[PDB]
């Protein structure tokens, strides 16, 4: 059930995705409709296992910010 999404930022540099760290995982909390995130089928409750090929379990906010807000982003999803 593991999938990969390969996302492209929109014209304003955004993806339309809200991620939440909750005990033992990073999860999708909100996907804006008609966004790059919604176009690759991300949904509430999806678990993000990898970001740009790195396992992201237990990442701090700083680490996520560095990786995600330092125009292709990849994520491994369960």
């Amino acid at each position: 059930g593991i999938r990969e999404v390969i996302l492209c930022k929109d014209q304003d540099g955004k993806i339309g995705l809200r991620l939440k760290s909750v005990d033992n995982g990073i999860f999708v909390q909100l996907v804006q409709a008609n966004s790059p995130a919604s176009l690759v089928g991300l949904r509430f409750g999806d678990q993000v296992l990898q970001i740009n090929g790195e396992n992201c379990a237990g990442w701090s906010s700083d680490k996520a910010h560095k990786v995600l807000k330092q125009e292709k982003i990849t994520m491994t999803i369960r």
């Binding site: 939440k20 909750v22 995600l68």
Partner: peptide, 7 residues
Amino acid sequence: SHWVXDI
């Protein structure tokens, strides 16, 4: 129990 980030 932890952070939120919008991307």
